[PDB]
């Protein structure tokens, strides 16, 4: 029932609101924080070293109303680097709580 065009429009607005935050949000307490970023799926804020960072499931998802308590996660290492998957230069991410159904 949810169309591609409606989802694309919602995603563009999510990206725009995210870009506003990336530019406007105050600087991190220290350089040891992992840097905020938009990874095409979710908008990530700066991360405290050695901690998990969570954001709600992206609101543009067609099934967003079905995962309102969900969160997507990343891990900011003690050295201030987003944990990376051994597979590549991509960050480890846990999106399981935002999957359909």
């Amino acid at each position: 029932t949810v169309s591609l065009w409606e989802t694309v429009q919602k995603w563009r607005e999510y990206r725009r609101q995210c870009q506003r935050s990336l530019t406007e949000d105050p600087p991190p307490a220290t350089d040891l924080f992992c840097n905020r970023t938009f990874d095409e799926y979710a908008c990530w804020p700066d991360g405290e070293p050695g901690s998990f960072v969570n954001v709600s499931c992206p609101w543009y998802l067609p099934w967003a109303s079905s995962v309102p308590q969900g969160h997507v996660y990343r891990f900011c290492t003690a050295e201030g680097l987003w944990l990376q998957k051994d597979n590549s230069s991509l960050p480890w991410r846990d999106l399981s709580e935002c999957e359909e159904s």
Binding site: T1, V2, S3, L4, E6, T7, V8, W11, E40, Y41, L61, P62, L95, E100
Partner: peptide, 26 residues
């Protein structure tokens, strides 16, 4: 899930889902 409109609706719903899968993996 037995009528032509069930398949058509399913097909239409897949475009949005493929878009998401593309954002996730890419």
């Amino acid at each position: 899930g037995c009528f032509t409109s069930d398949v058509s609706s399913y097909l239409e719903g897949q475009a949005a889902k493929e878009f998401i899968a593309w954002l996730v993996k890419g």
